[PDB]
Amino acid sequence: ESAKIFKEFLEDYESGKKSFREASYDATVKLFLWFLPRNIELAEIALRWLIMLESKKVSFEEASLIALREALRWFKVRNNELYKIIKEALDDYESGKKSFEEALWDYYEKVLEYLLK
Structure with missing residues (x-):
């Protein structure tokens, strides 16, 4: 069920049905709800990303950088x-090797292949 969150991101982003930030936002919301009964601090990382986006005081990039660096410390x-996947993203x-959208795009499809394999 976690996999589909990332599959539906790639479906909606690569199709052009949603912008990157709208598809990533919905993906993070689904991840927070998926983390609620399984991992609280992982849900805490995803929720503060949502609070950073909803507070209107943090940019999408800085909020993603903050949340990614905390998940990297948790998975360390x-x-x-x-x-490895979070660090490479x-x-x-x-x-500057990749833009923000394509670095996270690879992150979303590389997290998906991990769940599949």
């Missing part, structure tokens, strides 16, 4: 596979 001592974006 629990899952090296997911730590931050690396590619903060190094």
